[PDB]
């Protein structure tokens, strides 16, 4: 406190003298047991114990002294009571650097966001709000005269509350004389319009129809004639037609909104002055004309504050004159016409109101507008999580004590304890104010008090609460006496988007509303339930304010094209001519076509042509991002499509992505696993680098892989220091831009589920603040080239906050068809070898066109042939297409998906073509011609899709798989009656072979009978190692999954085992396994080398491969959010291929370092499904039983080597093992899991 | 059965007043029954017959049980003397609990001003208000003094506290705790375990309500000038009265129980005071024109009374009472405060212009108030009492539930007997999935579908589990526990259903809603999309209505090339059995009319429960400019006879010289289903 401030010394001498006494001797005890750190030497200092109490006593003391002061500062400037300790201590010694406190002023004030000063700030020459609005002061004040903060900063309040005051009072005198016309000059309108603010212009238009009305309501009470309403409606109708021509036009945003606030009331007026001619109202006192709100000028007061009084019905209040800059006009439906009758009933009778409704209907905000309308600061307290309790009794203390209003947003969702609490303060302070409204009460001398805090504090006759309620649950019991319920059941949402478009300048804004309403109904109801649907009325505005954009975009397009030309250019001529409906159908599609899915896009166009028929959508096509999208996807071998051609629907996602990009700052891919997000979003980057020339990094920053604080950063609970967090250091390295990171497009992807535990720091970036709030008290600004983006899976963990925040386009499953993924496959094939290592890796960067490098190797000429001979098989109507629709029919131990059946038949097919190597290399004499080349591929081709589709099925559904195969193939398959076809290998020759040749019936010694390291070969063992020699050349996270002791860690060692290349590292999970396990075992049985590319994590035994195995992928428990974190991280250490440090924070990349997991199967009890995410990449094997014969085989071998011991014996070898198995097979058919979760009966036994 | 067609003077006992008094003998039985027996069987007799009299039937059981006089001490007013002076431990605490709105202090108050032993009143939520109850409670542990807490229910933890501490006492004889308090699930179970609980009522009646309210109101306030204001005040309470009253009929009276209380009461005083003092600058006397009577209508229509309301039809209702009272012609020596009490008699208001002369008027009301008081109909009593009946015979059930493996599993066999098996799917053709019926239909069979198979499944594995062949998991568990008890199920909620529903019903319901499924997925099958807009669906059966009533809307819009925007529903009711239907109308079947009945296409009030409407027309057609007509009246048409869920409002025209204020009055509605 006393060393980050240097005017705080200043204001406590006595204060900074003790703790800077207490400091010295502190620092000298410090460096005394610094010496000497041993504990017995500490506790034979001579008299540390009474020195020490002494230190707690007076730190103590100055700790509560320093409470004394800040509560005197908060209680001489009420507004201070609305910003935290920390804060204040930040303004209170910052004095000299006044350009410090530009960030607190939006807590005080209500639209004050900055002052304007001198040139060497000592005086405050005005304020300035959020948009740029500024108001300059009628006598600015002077911070050299008032130093201290207290004075200067009250009297800048004062100063700009009378300042209002007379800048409102100049403007009613100028629209006086704009009134009393039958024809007012748009230029002096606008003139008018711009000169003065528009909370000004609003309130100065307000008084003027108010007194024009009771002029005229007086005159015909004498007269009796409705003469002179008929002339109040004719100018309010001749002024909304100006406003009308003016916003057709080109005009500044703060213009833009003044007039759409002018035009938002006007239509009000007019509606008001309509009912009021039918009405036939003669005299003024008539209830028809006091119900509505009315404002009364007065410049003669003396006080400013009591210039200006507003009295609807009963109740009268004067203005506040709080500036509140340019806020959101509400369009004065008669739902809240009856709010605001109803709220200011309650406020005449000193009784807060209590709107109760669903959400949406406009509770908050119509409160905050009745609010802004009186000109009273009006605070709105979101009840949701993010609820600071702690500061709430300060909070009420200065709305006690300034006279600012107080909303909750949703009352009911408070806890119980914090909805008491909140209640009882609430209850004391409606008492307080209550006790306003006795007659006997004088009123020379009222000092109304509350007690809050401990403490007595006058309550403002002004101030107000209102507590905001929504059913499905009512108020407290306590505060049913003393407030008044209103329901807010259903807004009116035709006249909202009614006034809205006749805002935007839709000339056919009626029926466009009539149109536009029951067709977001329809877009609610019929439409699939979706959690990022937002149907509400916040929707449907943001989608009429992007309409009246894109009318007005066309407008100045039309305009642009006409001055190119030869032709005059008249704005109302061409706002005539152009068709509304098809904007407001354009907009509507552009906001939300991208948020759905892929079977209700059909539905929408239905639904929209009926309620809007016979108009159509033409998309915009970007013809240069379409050709960079076209190039660049080239480049990388992906498939490119326009429109109706295969792929068209993934480029229309990645379009409908770089509008969001371009809207919004944050923005969500919520896409199901293996849809061609991560694709999209790459080929994006890529694509606005080429185009734009501006250099595309991106950082993609798993959140689940590591802890929040990790994430975030934490601060040290003793010595303060402040550690950054992962995002928080990248946040930081852009800001800074040492190395121009400014001038490059930031896209920071999460690539992770969406929990509401890691976005509740997001909360504040994805706002409009862009801003990143720290624990240490650090403010970090996103800068404008920086996009946040999430690629999740789902929202179904995801709070309402995080999505409403931020754009979305969702990529359904259906965008990424089987016939692109074919087409990179066999282009990958076609062009990326596999021999090599490091080398003609980098070069294909290097190589634009790669010409001349065609024939480089041998591989590259046989992979090329290869696919050449497997392309008819891959076509849309091919073998593969119709074995893949098949199997997805078929049941599958794991839940199945299309990528990873695709991955595995593509590793199996790159291995095919490896071996061909092999055997070319092995036979240099005679290669391998194209026919036998032809033959080997299409053998292994189906033997290939036969272990991938039905490798995670059971036995006889492979064989279903297999006969399924073989009545829709054409190639030559074994034509042995009654053998699986999965039986039978391929070898280097086209034709078959059957596995069983490969197993030999090997003669086990009489010792290790039954040693763990003893394989008999059998069909299974023989096939599955095979199978892991082929998913472990290509180097993936294979993953085996079966029946307790069926074989799979031990096929998987002996098939391990046969490559002296790699060791395993046996790693057991649970439910508590955490990455923490990983991070130990990588720093065991690696090391970290700092490669100059950057830092990269290998083994220490130079040459060697390393293998982890985790024996039980499924045992790590979900979280309460599901998406188990060390899978998480294995997904992104496998995908991304590499993890970002705890402490570094530092991309590390691995290098020979594999993932090969064991699991059981989900059924079984405690085992956790696996995520697709993390599911894609691995290819998946079923190691069941061996059944009879297999367990026939082996252990008879095992009862020979048994009894050789024996030479008599030896002869009972079959018939005992016969025996074994029989018995074995009963006790397994006997004993099910059904009965006893213990009777498993494994081949362990 | 047989006995019904062999008496002929049933008639006269169906249709009587009170049938349960005189039951005819109606059962065959080989002895001679006795007292008891006939009490018993006479019950079930009217229980089948005469529901709404079995309130009355159950008091005559009693009587002739336990003696006739065993219900008469309760109709007695309570006496605090001898309960408090005896029969209470001095540690006990008298929990005083009462109906929200309604006080009991003046009772104990009373009782020691008879009693002539001093007692002090502390109100309890502030701490200062703990502090002193805490100290008058010690002063009279030793001074033996009474002690009334005031709303102790806002304090349930210092309830507790209090609680312990009552039990470590060692209270004097002549000390006494008196603890007022409402009606609230928040207080402990502890303090009501070891207090005598006594429950204050308010008296019903609308001459108890207003004698009530005028005595709230303190003389000098309605005394004060003008002398208009104790007529307005007595329009005010007479309102207040009918209102709070005709929340007890209710969904019929008021669409949901609103908290029509004395916070209300005292806005709208204090609103008539503040507009009668405006508009009579202290004039002695002003003309009933001069009256604000729109200030007033206005402030009770929108803030004072229809803040609370939030259903549009309630808030019609509201506006029609207050624009039949608070009028000019109310000050009329001849003025109707209701209409048609007993067809002949109409209650007029008082010729007095003094609040004692109200008060005395007030107190001559006959004590035989009939819900047509209240613009009700005269029926609706029947169905209260009927209501009251179907609960007490299911509060005793509740109480009779305090081995049944056999007959859960018997109750699950028979379910699944009566259920149907499956649903198909509708095909989708690439012709039929433009017909936005077919769309509907295709998603009311696909989710009905997903219901039925998860409750088979789950009814089956029922089966099994009652069969000791299946384990226990926790859905499992908590199903059973659920059916055995009779709540529906959670799961099976996936469609909106009345409050309050047995399984039974529900299973029934259920059945229905499959069957007509199967019907229409049968006819789709059969003719492809034609049938599909020729067929009779029931409203009720149909888990989304409005989704249905947005289908036809969107089919008539398609087929016609109208856009949707543009049209409006005209509602026919055909009597004819299988009656032509035209290109954009659609057959509506199961609709019931509560409190009227339809001829021609033409609403006439009726004193029947409800009125089934043959076959009902949906027809949309362009909308039209032309001014709706004065003898037209528009009709809610609630889901069910909850009358929670608001689906579409039709309209009708009324028959020969009917007010549609008395439609508005007597709740009358369409029901999809009974
Ligand atoms: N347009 C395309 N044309 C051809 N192949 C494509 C295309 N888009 C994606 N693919 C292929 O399909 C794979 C899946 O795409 P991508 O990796 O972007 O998915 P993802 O949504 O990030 O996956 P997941 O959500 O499962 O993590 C790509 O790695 C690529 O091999
Ligand atoms: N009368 C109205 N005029 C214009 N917009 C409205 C009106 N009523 C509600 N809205 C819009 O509906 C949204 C509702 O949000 P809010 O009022 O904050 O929550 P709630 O409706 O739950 O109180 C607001 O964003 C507001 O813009
Ligand atoms: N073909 C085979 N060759 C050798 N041993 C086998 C064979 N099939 C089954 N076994 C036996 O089955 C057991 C498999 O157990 P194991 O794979 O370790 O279980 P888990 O995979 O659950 O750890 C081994 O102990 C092994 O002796
Ligand atoms: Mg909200
Ligand atoms: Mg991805």
Redesign the interface.
């Known amino acids: 406190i006393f060393t980050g401030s240097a005017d705080i010394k200043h204001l406590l001498p006595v204060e900074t003298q003790r703790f800077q006494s207490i400091s010295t001797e502190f620092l000298a005890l410090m460096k005394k047991v610094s010496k000497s750190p041993l504990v017995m030497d500490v506790l034979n200092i001579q008299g540390v114990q009474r020195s020490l109490e002494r230190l707690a006593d007076l730190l103590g003391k100055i700790q509560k002294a320093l409470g004394e002061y800040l509560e005197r500062e908060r209680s001489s400037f009420p507004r201070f009571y609305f910003v935290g300790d920390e804060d204040l201590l930040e303004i209170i010694g910052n004095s000299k650097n006044v350009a410090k406190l530009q960030k607190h002023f939006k807590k005080m004030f209500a639209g004050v966001s900055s002052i304007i000063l001198n040139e060497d700030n000592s005086v405050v020459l005005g304020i300035s709000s959020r948009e740029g609005e500024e108001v300059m002061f009628k006598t600015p004040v002077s911070i050299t005269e008032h130093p201290k903060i207290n004075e200067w900063l009250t009297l800048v309040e004062k100063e700009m509350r009378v300042t209002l005051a007379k800048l409102l009072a100049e403007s009613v005198t100028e629209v006086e004389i704009f009134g009393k016309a039958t024809s007012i000059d748009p230029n002096t309108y606008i003139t008018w319009i711009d000169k003065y603010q528009a909370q000004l212009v609003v309130l100065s238009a307000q008084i003027a129809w108010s007194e024009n009305v009771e002029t005229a309501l007086s005159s015909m009470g004498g007269g009796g004639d409705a003469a002179p309403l008929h002339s109040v409606l004719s100018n309010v109708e001749v002024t909304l037609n100006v406003l009308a021509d003016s916003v057709l036009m080109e005009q500044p945003p703060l213009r833009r909104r003044k007039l759409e606030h002018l035009i938002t009331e006007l239509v009000h007026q007019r509606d008001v002055t309509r009912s009021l001619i039918k009405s036939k109202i003669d005299n003024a006192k008539?209830?028809?004309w006091?119900?509505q709100m009315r404002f009364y000028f007065d410049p003669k007061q003396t006080d400013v504050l009591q210039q200006l009084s507003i009295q609807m019905?009963?109740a009268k209040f004067n203005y506040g004159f709080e500036y509140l800059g340019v806020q959101d006009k509400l369009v004065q439906t008669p739902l809240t016409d009856?709010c605001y009758?109803?709220m200011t009933?309650?406020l005449e009778?000193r009784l807060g109101g209590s709107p109760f409704?669903p959400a949406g209907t406009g509770k908050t905000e119509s409160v905050k507008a009745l609010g802004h309308q009186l000109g009273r600061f009006v605070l709105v307290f979101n009840c949701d999580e993010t609820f600071d309790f702690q500061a709430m009794g300060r909070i009420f203390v200065g709305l006690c004590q300034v006279g600012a209003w107080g909303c909750f947003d949703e009352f009911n969702r408070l806890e119980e304890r914090m909805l008491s609490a909140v209640s009882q303060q609430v209850?004391?302070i409606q008492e307080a104010l209550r006790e306003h409204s006795n007659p006997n009460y004088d009123k020379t001398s009222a000092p109304i008090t509350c007690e809050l805090l401990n403490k007595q504090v006058k309550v403002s006759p002004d101030m107000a609460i209102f507590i905001t309620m929504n059913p499905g649950s009512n108020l407290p019991?306590?505060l049913?006496?003393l407030f008044?319920?209103?329901?807010m059941?259903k807004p009116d949402r035709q006249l909202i988007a009614q006034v809205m478009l006749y805002s935007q300048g839709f000339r056919t804004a009626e029926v466009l509303a009539?149109?536009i309403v029951?067709?977001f109904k329809?877009c609610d109801?019929?439409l699939s339930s979706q959690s990022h649907y937002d149907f509400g009325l916040r929707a449907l505005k943001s989608v009429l304010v992007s309409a009246g954009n894109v009318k007005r975009e066309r407008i100045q397009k039309i305009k642009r094209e006409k001055e190119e030309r030869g032709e005059a250019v008249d704005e109302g001529e061409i706002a005539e001519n152009l068709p509304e409906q098809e904007i407001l159908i354009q907009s509507v599609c552009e906001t939300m076509v991208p948020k759905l899915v892929a079977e209700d896009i059909?539905?929408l166009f239905?639904?929209l042509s009926?309620?809007?028929?016979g108009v159509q959508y033409h998309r915009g096509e970007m013809t240069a991002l379409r050709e960079e999208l076209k190039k660049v996807c080239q480049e990388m071998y992906l498939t490119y499509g326009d429109g109706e051609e295969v792929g068209g629907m993934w480029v229309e996602k990645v379009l409908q992505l770089y509008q969001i990009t371009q809207i919004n700052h944050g923005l969500m891919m919520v896409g199901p696993s293996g849809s061609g997000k991560s694709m999209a979003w790459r080929v994006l980057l890529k694509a606005l680098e080429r185009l734009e020339g501006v250099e595309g990094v991106a950082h993609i920053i798993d959140p689940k892989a590591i802890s929040k604080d990790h994430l975030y950063g934490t601060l040290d609970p003793n010595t303060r220091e402040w550690t950054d967090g992962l995002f928080t250091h990248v946040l930081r390295k852009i800001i800074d831009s040492v190395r121009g990171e400014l001038q490059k497009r930031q896209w920071i992807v999460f690539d992770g589920d969406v929990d509401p535990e890691w976005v509740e720091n997001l909360n504040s970036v994805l706002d409009d603040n862009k801003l990143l709030t720290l624990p240490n008290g650090e403010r970090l600004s996103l800068p404008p080239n920086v996009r946040i983006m999430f690629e999740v899976q789902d929202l179904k963990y995801a709070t309402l906050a995080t999505v409403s925040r931020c754009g979305m386009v969702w990529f359904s499953e259906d965008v990424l068809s089987t016939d692109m993924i074919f087409n990179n496959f066999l282009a990958r094939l076609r062009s990326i070898p596999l021999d090599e290592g490091e080398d003609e890796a980098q070069r294909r960067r290097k190589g634009k066109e790669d010409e001349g490098e065609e024939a480089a190797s041998p591989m590259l000429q046989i992979q090329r042939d290869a696919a050449t001979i497997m392309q008819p098989y891959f076509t849309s109507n091919g073998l593969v297409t119709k074995a893949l629709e098949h199997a997805f029919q078929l049941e599958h131990i794991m839940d199945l998906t299309r990528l990873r059946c695709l991955g595995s038949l593509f590793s199996m097919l790159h291995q095919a073509c490896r071996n061909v190597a092999q055997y070319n290399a092995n036979h240099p004499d005679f290669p391998m011609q194209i026919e036998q080349l032809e033959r080997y591929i299409q053998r292994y081709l189906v033997y290939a899709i036969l272990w991938s589709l039905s490798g995670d099925s059971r036995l006889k559904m492979r064989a279903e798989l297999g006969e399924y195969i073989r009545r829709i193939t054409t190639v030559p398959l074994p034509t042995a009656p009654n053998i699986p076809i999965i039986d039978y290998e391929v070898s280097i020759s086209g034709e078959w072979s059957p596995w069983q040749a490969k197993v030999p019936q090997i003669e086990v010694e009489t010792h290790k009978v039954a040693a763990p390291d003893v394989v008999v070969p059998t069909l299974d063992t023989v096939r599955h190692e095979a199978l892991l020699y082929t998913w472990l050349a290509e180097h993936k996270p294979l993953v085996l999954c079966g029946p307790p002791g069926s074989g799979k860690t031990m096929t998987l060692f002996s098939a391990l085992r046969a490559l002296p290349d790699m060791e395993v590292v046996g790693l057991n999970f649970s439910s508590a396994t955490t990455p923490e396990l990983l991070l130990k075992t990588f720093d065991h049985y690696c090391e970290y080398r700092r490669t100059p590319n950057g830092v990269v994590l290998a083994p220490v035994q130079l040459g060697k491969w390393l293998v982890l195995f985790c024996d039980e992928i499924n045992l790590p428990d979900m979280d309460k959010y599901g998406t188990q974190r060390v899978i998480s991280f294995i997904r992104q250490m496998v995908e991304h291929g590499g993890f970002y440090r705890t402490s570094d924070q530092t991309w590390v990349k691995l290098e020979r370092i594999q993932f090969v997991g064991a699991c059981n199967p989900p059924t079984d009890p405690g085992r956790k499904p696996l995520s697709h995410r993390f599911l894609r990449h691995v290819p998946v094997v079923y190691v069941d039983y061996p059944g009879p014969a297999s367990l026939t085989q082996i252990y008879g071998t095992f009862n020979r080597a048994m009894l050789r011991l024996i030479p008599s014996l030896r002869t009972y070898a079959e018939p005992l093992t016969a025996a074994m198995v029989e018995f074995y097979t009963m006790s397994q058919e006997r004993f099910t899991q059904?009965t006893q979760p213990h009777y498993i009966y494994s081949p362990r036994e | 059965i047989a006995k019904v067609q062999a008496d002929e003077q049933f008639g006269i006992w169906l249709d009587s007043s009170s049938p349960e008094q005189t039951v005819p003998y109606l059962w065959s039985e080989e002895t001679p029954a006795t007292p008891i027996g006939q009490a018993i069987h006479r019950l079930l007799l009217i229980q089948a017959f005469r529901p709404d009299r079995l309130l009355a039937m159950a008091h005559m059981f009693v009587s002739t049980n336990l003696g006739e006089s065993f219900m008469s001490i309760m109709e007695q007013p309570l006496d605090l003397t001898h309960i408090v002076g005896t029969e209470v431990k001095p540690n006990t605490p008298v929990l005083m609990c009462s109906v929200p709105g309604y006080d009991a202090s003046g009772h104990v108050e009373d009782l020691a001003a008879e009693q002539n032993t001093q007692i002090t009143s502390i109100a309890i939520?502030?701490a200062e208000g703990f502090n002193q109850a805490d100290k008058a409670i010690n002063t009279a542990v030793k001074s033996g003094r009474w002690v009334m807490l005031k709303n102790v229910?806002?304090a349930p933890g210092w309830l507790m506290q209090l609680e312990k501490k009552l039990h470590s006492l060692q209270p004097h004889a002549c000390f006494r705790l008196f603890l007022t308090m409402?009606i609230?699930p928040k207080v402990p179970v502890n303090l009501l375990r070891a207090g005598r609980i006594f429950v204050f009522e308010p008296p019903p009646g609308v001459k108890a309500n207003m004698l009530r309210t005028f005595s709230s109101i303190p003389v000098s306030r309605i005394c004060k000038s003008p002398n208009e204001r104790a007529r307005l005040y007595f329009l005010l309470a007479w309102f207040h009265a009918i209102i709070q009253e005709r929340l007890r009929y209710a969904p019929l009276g008021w669409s949901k129980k609103y908290?029509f209380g004395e916070?209300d009461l005292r806005?709208a005083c204090?609103?008539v005071d503040?507009?009668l003092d405006?508009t009579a600058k202290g004039r002695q006397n002003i003309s009933p024109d001069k009256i604000?009577w729109?200030?007033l209508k206005?402030?009770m229509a929108?803030?004072?009374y229809?803040?609370?309301?939030?259903?549009?039809f309630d808030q019609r209702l509201l506006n029609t009472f207050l624009e039949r009272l608070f009028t000019t012609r109310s000050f009329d020596s001849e003025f109707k405060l209701a209409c048609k009490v007993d067809g002949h008699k109409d209650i007029q208001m008082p010729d007095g212009i003094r609040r004692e002369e109200f008060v005395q008027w007030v107190e001559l009301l006959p004590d035989t108030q009939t819900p047509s008081w209240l613009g009700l109909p005269n029926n609706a009593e029947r169905v209260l009492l009927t209501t009251q009946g179907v609960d007490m015979i299911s509060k005793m059930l509740k109480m009779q539930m305090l081995a049944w493996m056999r007959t859960l599993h018997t109750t699950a066999s028979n379910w699944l007997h009566l259920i149907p098996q499956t649903l198909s799917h509708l095909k989708r053709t690439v012709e039929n999935?433009?017909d936005?019926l077919f769309?509907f239909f295709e998603r009311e069979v696909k989710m009905g579908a997903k219901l039925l198979q998860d409750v088979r499944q789950d009814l089956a594995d029922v089966v099994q589990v009652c069969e000791g062949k299946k384990?226990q998991t926790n859905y499992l568990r908590t199903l059973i526990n659920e059916l055995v008890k009779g709540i529906l199920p959670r799961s099976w909620s996936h469609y909106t259903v009345p409050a309050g529903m047995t399984v039974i019903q529900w299973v029934s319901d259920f059945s229905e809603r499959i069957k007509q499924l199967q019907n229409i997925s049968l006819a789709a099958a059969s003719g492809g999309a034609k049938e599909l807009k020729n067929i009779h669906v029931c409203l009720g059966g149909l888990f989304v209505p409005?989704?249905y009533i947005?289908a036809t809307r969107?089919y008539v819009?398609?087929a016609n090339?109208?856009?949707?925007?543009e049209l409006c529903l005209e509602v026919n009711v055909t009597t004819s059995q299988g009656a032509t239907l035209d290109a954009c109308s659609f057959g509506v079947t199961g609709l019931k009319l509560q409190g009227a009945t339809c001829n021609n296409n033409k609403l006439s009030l009726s004193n029947a429960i409800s009125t089934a409407l043959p076959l009902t027309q949906l027809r949309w057609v362009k909308q039209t400019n032309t001014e709706k007509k004065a003898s037209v009246v528009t009709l809610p048409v609630y889901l069910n006879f909850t009358r929670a869920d608001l689906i579409f409002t039709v309209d009708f025209e009324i028959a020969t010289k009917e007010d549609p204020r008395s439609f508005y009055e007597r709740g009358v509605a369409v029901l999809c289903t009974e």
Do not use: M, Y
């Open positions: 008539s209830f028809e006091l119900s019905a009963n009856r009758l109803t009933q309650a009778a409704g209850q004391c019991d306590n049913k006496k008044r319920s209103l329901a059941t009539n149109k029951p067709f329809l109801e019929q059909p539905l239905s639904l009926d309620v809007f028929p059904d | 939520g502030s229910h806002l409402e609230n908290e916070s806005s204090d609103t503040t507009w405006d604000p729109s200030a206005t402030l929108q803030s004072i229809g803040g609370r309301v939030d259903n549009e999935i433009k936005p769309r384990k409005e989704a947005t969107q819009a398609q090339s109208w856009s949707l925007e």
